[PDB]
mmCIF file of N, CA and C in Angstrom:
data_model
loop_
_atom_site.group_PDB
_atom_site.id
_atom_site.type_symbol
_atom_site.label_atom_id
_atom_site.label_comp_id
_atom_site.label_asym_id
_atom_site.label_seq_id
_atom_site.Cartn_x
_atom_site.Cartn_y
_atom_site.Cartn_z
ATOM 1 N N UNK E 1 0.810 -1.215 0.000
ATOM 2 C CA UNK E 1 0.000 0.000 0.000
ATOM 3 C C UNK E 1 0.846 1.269 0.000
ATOM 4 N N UNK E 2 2.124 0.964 -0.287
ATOM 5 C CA UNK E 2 3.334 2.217 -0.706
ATOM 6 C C UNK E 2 3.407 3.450 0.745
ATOM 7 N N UNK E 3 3.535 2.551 1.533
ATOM 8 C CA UNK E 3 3.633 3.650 3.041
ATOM 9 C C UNK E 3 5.495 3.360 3.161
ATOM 10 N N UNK E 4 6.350 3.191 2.200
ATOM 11 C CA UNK E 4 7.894 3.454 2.380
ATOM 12 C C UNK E 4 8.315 3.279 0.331
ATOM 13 N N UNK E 5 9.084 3.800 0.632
ATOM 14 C CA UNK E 5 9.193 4.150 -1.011
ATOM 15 C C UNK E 5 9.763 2.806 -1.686
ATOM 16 N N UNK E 6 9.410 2.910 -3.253
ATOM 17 C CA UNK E 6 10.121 1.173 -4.249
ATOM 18 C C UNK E 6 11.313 1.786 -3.680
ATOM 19 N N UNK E 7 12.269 2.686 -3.532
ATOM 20 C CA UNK E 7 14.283 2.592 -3.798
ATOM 21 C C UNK E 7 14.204 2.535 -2.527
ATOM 22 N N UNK E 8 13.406 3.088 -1.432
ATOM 23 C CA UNK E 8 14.064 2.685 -0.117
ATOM 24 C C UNK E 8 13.673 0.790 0.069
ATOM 25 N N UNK E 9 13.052 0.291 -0.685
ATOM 26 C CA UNK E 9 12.530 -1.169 -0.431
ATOM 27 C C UNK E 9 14.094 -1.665 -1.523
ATOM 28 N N UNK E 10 14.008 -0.944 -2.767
ATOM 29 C CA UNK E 10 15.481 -0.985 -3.158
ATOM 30 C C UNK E 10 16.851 -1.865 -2.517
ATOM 31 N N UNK E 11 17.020 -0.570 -1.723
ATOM 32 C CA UNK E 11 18.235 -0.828 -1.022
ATOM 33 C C UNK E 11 18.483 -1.321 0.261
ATOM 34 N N UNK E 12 17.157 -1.244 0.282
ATOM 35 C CA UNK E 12 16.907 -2.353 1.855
ATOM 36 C C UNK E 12 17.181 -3.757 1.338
ATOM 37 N N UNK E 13 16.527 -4.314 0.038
ATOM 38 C CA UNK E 13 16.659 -5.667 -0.242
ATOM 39 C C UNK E 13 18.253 -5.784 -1.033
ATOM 40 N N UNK E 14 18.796 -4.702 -1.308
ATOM 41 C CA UNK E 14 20.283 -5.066 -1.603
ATOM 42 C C UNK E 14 20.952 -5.292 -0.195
ATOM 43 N N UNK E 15 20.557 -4.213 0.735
ATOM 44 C CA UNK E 15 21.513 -4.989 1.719
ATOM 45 C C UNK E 15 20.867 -6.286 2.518
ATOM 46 N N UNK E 16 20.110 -6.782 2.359
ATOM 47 C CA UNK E 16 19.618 -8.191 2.326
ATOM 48 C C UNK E 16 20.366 -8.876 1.583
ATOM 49 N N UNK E 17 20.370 -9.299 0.511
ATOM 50 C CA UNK E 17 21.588 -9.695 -0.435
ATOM 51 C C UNK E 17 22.733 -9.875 -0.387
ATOM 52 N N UNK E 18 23.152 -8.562 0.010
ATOM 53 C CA UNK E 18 24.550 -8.363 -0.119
ATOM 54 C C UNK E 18 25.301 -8.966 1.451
ATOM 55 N N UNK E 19 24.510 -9.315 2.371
ATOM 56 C CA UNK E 19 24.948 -9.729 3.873
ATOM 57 C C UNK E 19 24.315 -11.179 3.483
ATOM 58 N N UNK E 20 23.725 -11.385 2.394
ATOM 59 C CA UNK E 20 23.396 -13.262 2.261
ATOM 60 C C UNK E 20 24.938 -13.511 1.398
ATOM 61 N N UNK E 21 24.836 -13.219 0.637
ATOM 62 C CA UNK E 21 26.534 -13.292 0.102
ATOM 63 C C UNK E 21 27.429 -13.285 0.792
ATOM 64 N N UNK E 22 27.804 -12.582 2.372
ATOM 65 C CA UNK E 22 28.713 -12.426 3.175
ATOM 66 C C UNK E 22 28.126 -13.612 3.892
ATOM 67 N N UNK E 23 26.828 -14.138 4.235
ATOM 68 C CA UNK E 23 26.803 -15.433 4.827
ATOM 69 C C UNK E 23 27.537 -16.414 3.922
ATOM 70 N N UNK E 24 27.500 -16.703 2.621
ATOM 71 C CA UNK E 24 27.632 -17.610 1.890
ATOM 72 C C UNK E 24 29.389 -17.369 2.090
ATOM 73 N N UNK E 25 29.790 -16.427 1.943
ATOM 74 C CA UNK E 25 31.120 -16.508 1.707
ATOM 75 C C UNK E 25 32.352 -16.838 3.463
ATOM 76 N N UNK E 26 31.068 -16.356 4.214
ATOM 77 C CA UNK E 26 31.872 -17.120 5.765
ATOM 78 C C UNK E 26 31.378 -18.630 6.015
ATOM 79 N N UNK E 27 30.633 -19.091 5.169
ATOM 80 C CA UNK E 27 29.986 -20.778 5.460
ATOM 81 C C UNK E 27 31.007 -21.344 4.204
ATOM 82 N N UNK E 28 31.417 -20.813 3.324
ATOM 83 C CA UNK E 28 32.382 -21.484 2.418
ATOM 84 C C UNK E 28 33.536 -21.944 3.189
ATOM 85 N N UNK E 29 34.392 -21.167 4.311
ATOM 86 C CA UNK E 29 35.394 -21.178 5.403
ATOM 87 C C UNK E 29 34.738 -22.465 5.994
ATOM 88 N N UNK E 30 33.598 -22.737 6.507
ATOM 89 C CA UNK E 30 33.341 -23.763 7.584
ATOM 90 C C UNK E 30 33.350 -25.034 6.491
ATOM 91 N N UNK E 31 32.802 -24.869 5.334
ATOM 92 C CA UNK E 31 33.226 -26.259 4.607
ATOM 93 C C UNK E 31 34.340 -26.271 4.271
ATOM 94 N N UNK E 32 35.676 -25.549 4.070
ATOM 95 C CA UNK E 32 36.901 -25.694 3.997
ATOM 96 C C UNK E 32 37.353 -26.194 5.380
ATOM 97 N N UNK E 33 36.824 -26.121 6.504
ATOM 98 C CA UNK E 33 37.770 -26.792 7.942
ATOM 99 C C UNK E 33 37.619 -28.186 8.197
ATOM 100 N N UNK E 34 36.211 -28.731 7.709
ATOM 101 C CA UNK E 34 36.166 -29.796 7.244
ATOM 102 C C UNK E 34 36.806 -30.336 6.244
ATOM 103 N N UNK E 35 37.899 -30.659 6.181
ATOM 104 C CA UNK E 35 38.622 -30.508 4.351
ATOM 105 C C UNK E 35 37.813 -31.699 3.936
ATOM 106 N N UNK E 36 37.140 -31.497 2.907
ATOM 107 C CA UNK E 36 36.421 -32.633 1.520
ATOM 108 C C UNK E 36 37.502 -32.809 0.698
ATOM 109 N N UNK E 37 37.172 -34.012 0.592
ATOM 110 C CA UNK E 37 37.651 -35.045 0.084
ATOM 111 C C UNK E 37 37.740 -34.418 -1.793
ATOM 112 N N UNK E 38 38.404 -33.919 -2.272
ATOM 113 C CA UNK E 38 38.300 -33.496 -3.546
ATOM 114 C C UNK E 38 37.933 -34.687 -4.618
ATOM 115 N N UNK E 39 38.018 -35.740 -4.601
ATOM 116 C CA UNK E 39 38.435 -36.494 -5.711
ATOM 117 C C UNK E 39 37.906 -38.141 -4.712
ATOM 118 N N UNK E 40 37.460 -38.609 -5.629
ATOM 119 C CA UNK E 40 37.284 -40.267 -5.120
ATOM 120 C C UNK E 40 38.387 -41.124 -5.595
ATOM 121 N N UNK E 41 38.480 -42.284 -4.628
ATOM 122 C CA UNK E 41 40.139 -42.628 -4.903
ATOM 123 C C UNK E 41 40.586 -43.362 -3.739
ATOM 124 N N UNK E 42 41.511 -44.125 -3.367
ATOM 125 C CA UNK E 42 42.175 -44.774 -2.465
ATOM 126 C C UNK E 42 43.118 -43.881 -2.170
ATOM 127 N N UNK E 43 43.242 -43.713 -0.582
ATOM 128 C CA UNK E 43 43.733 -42.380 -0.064
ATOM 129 C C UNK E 43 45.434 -43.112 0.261
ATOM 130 N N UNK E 44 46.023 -42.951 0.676
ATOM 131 C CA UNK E 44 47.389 -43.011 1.306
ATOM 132 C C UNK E 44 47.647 -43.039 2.525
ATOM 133 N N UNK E 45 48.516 -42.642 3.274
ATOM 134 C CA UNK E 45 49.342 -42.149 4.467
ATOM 135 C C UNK E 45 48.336 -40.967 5.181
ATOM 136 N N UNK E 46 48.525 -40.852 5.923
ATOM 137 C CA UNK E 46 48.249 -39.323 6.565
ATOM 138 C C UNK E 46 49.227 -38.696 7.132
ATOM 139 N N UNK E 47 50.183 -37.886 6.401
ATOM 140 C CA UNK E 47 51.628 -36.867 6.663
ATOM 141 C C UNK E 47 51.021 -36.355 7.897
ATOM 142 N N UNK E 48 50.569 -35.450 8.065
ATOM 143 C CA UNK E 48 50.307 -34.967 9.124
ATOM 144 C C UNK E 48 48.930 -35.580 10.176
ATOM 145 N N UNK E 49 49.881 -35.824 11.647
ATOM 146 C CA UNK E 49 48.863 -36.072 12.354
ATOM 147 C C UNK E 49 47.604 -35.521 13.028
ATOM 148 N N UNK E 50 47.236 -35.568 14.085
ATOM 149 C CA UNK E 50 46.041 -34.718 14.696
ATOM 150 C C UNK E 50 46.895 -33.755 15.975
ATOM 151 N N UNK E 51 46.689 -32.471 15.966
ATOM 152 C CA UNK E 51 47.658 -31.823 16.755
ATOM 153 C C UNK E 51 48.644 -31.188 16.110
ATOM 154 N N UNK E 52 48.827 -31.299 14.865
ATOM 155 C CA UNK E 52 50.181 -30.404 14.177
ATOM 156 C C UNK E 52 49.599 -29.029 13.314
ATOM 157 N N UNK C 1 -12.903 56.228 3.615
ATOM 158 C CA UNK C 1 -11.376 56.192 3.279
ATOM 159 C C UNK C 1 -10.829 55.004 4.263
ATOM 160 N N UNK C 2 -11.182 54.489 4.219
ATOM 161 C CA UNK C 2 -11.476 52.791 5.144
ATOM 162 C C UNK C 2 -11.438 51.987 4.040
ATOM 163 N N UNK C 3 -12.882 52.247 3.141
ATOM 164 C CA UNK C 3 -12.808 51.103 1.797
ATOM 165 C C UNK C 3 -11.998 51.246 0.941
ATOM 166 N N UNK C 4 -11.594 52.779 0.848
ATOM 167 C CA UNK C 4 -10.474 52.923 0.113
ATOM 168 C C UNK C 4 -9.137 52.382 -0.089
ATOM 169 N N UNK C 5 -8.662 52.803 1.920
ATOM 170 C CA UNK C 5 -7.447 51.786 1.869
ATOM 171 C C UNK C 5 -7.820 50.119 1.631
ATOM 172 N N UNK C 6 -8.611 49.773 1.996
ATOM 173 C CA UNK C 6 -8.938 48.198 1.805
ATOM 174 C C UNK C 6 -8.972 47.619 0.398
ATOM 175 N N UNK C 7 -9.590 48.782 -0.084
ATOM 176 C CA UNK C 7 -9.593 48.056 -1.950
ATOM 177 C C UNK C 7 -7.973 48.396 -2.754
ATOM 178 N N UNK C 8 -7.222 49.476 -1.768
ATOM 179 C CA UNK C 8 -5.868 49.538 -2.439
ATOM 180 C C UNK C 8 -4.706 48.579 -2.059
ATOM 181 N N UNK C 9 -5.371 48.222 -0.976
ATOM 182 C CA UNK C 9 -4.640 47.055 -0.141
ATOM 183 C C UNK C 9 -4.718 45.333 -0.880
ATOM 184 N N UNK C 10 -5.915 45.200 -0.540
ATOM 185 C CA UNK C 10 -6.477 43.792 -0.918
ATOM 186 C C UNK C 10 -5.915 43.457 -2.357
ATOM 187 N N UNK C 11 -5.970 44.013 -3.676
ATOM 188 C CA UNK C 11 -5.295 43.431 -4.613
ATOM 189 C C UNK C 11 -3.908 43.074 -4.442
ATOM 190 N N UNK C 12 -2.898 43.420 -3.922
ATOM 191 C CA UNK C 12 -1.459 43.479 -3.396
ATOM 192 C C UNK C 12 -1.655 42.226 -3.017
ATOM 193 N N UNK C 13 -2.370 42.248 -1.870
ATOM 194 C CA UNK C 13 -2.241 40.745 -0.598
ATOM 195 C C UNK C 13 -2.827 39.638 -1.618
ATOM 196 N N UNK C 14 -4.117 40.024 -2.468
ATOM 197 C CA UNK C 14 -4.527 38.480 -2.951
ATOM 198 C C UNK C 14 -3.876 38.811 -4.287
ATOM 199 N N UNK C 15 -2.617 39.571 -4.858
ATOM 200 C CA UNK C 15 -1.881 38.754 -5.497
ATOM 201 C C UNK C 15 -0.926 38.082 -5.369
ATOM 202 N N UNK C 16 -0.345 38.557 -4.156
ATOM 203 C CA UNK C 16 0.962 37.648 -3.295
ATOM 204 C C UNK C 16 0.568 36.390 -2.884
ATOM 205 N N UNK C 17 -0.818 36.309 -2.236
ATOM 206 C CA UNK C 17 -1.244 35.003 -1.500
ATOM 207 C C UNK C 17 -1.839 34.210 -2.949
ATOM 208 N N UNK C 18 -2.214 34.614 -4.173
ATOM 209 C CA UNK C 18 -2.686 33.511 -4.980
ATOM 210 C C UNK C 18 -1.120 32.954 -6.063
ATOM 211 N N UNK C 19 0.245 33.960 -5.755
ATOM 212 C CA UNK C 19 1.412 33.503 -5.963
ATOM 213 C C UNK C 19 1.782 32.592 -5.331
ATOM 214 N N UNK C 20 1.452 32.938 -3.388
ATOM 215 C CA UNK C 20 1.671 31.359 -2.778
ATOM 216 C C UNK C 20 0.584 30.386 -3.142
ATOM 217 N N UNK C 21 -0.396 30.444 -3.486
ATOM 218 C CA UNK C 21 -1.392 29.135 -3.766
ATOM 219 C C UNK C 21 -0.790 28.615 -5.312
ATOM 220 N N UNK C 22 0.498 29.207 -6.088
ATOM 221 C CA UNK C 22 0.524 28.607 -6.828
ATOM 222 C C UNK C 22 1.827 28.030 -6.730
ATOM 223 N N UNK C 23 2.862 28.443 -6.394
ATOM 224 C CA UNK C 23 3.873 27.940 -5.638
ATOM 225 C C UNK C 23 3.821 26.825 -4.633
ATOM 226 N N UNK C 24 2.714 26.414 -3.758
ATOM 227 C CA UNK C 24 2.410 25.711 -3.471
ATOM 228 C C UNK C 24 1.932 24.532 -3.989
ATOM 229 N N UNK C 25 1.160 24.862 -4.944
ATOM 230 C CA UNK C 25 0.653 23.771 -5.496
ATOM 231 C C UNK C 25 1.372 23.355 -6.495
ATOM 232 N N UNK C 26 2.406 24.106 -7.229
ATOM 233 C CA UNK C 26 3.557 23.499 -8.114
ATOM 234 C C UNK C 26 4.728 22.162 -6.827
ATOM 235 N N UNK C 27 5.127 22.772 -5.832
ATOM 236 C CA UNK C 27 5.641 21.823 -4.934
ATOM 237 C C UNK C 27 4.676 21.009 -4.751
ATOM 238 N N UNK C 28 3.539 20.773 -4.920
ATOM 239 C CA UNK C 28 2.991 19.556 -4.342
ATOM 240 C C UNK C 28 3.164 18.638 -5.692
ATOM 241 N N UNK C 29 2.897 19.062 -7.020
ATOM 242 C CA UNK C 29 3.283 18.532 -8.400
ATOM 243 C C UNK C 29 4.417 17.952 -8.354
ATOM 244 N N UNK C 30 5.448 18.748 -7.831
ATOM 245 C CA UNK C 30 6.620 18.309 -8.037
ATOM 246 C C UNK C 30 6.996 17.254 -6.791
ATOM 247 N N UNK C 31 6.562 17.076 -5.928
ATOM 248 C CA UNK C 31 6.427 15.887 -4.859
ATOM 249 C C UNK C 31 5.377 14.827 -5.249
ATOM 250 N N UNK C 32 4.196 14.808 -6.002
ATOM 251 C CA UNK C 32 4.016 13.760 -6.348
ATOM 252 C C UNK C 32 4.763 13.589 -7.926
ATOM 253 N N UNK C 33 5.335 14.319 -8.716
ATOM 254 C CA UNK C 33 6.453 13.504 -9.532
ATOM 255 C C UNK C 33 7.137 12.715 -9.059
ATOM 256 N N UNK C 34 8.030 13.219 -7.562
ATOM 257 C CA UNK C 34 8.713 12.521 -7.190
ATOM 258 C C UNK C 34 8.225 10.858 -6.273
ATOM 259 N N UNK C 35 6.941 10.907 -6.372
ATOM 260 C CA UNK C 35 6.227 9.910 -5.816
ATOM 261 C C UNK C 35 6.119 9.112 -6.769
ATOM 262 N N UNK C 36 5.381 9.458 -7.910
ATOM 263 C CA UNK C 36 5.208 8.272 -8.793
ATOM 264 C C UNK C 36 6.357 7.553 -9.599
ATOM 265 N N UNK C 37 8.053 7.953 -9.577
ATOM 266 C CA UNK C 37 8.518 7.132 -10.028
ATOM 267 C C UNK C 37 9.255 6.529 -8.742
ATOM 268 N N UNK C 38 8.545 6.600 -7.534
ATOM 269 C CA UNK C 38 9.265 6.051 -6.396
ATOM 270 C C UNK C 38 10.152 6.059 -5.733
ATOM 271 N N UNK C 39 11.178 7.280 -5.408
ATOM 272 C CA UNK C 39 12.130 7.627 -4.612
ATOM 273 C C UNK C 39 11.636 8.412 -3.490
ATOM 274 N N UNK C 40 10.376 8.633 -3.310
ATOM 275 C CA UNK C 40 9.718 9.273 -2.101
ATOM 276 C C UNK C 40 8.758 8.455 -1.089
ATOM 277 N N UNK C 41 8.270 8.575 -0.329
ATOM 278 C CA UNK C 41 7.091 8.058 0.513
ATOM 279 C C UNK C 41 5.692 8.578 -0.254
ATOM 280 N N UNK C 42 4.552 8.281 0.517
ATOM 281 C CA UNK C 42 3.555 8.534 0.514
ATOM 282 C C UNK C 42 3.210 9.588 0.664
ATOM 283 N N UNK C 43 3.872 8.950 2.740
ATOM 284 C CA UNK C 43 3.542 10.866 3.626
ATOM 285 C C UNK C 43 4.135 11.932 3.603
ATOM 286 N N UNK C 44 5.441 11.914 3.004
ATOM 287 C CA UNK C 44 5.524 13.469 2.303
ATOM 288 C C UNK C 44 4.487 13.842 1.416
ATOM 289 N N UNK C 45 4.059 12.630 0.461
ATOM 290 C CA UNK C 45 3.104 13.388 -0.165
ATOM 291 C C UNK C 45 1.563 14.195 0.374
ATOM 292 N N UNK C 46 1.694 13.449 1.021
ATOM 293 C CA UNK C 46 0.484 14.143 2.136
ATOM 294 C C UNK C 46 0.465 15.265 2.301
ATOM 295 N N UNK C 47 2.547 15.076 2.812
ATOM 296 C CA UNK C 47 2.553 16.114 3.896
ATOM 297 C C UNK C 47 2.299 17.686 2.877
ATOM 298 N N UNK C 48 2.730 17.483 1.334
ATOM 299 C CA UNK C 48 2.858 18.375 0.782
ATOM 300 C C UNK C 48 0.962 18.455 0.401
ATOM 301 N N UNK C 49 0.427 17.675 0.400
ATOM 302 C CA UNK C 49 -1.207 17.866 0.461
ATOM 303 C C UNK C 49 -1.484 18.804 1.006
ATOM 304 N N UNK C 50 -0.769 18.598 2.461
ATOM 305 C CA UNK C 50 -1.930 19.603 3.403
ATOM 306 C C UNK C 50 -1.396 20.947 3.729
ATOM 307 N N UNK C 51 0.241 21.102 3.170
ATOM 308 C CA UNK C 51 0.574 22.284 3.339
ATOM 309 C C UNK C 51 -0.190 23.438 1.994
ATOM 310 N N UNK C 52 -0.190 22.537 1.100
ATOM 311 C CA UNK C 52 -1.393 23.479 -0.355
ATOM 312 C C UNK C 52 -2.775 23.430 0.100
ATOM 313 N N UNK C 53 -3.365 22.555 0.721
ATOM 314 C CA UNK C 53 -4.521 23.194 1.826
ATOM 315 C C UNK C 53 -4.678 23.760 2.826
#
């Protein structure tokens, strides 16, 4: 019923957006600490232990 | 010499005051321009409503 303006709804929903992108890009970090498995395959050794 | 000054008076005042009724009502034009392509509110537009009334 237009009681706040389309550009202030604008830039309200860019910065909606633009802080979902900053979620996406700090949850990319939490699936990197988990390291995935890149590639399927019979793994090797483990060089480094738990603690280094 | 009462009606006199009054009738030499009164054109002056209601041409100044129908300059503000048009000045006014050009800002209210120009606030709902700025309404209908949406960089304003509503209630400015109002607000400019009720200052031209």
């Amino acid at each position: 019923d237009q009681a706040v303006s389309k550009q202030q709804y604008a830039d309200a929903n860019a910065a909606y957006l633009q802080s979902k992108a900053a979620v996406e890009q700090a949850r990319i970090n939490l699936r990197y600490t988990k390291v995935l498995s890149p590639i399927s395959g019979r793994i090797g050794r483990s060089a480094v232990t738990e603690g280094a | 010499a009462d009606g006199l000054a009054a009738r030499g008076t009164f054109t002056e005042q209601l041409q100044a005051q129908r300059d503000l009724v048009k000045a006014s009502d050009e800002y209210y034009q120009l606030a709902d321009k700025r309404y209908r392509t949406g960089v304003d509110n509503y209630l400015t537009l109002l607000d400019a409503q009720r200052s031209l009334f």
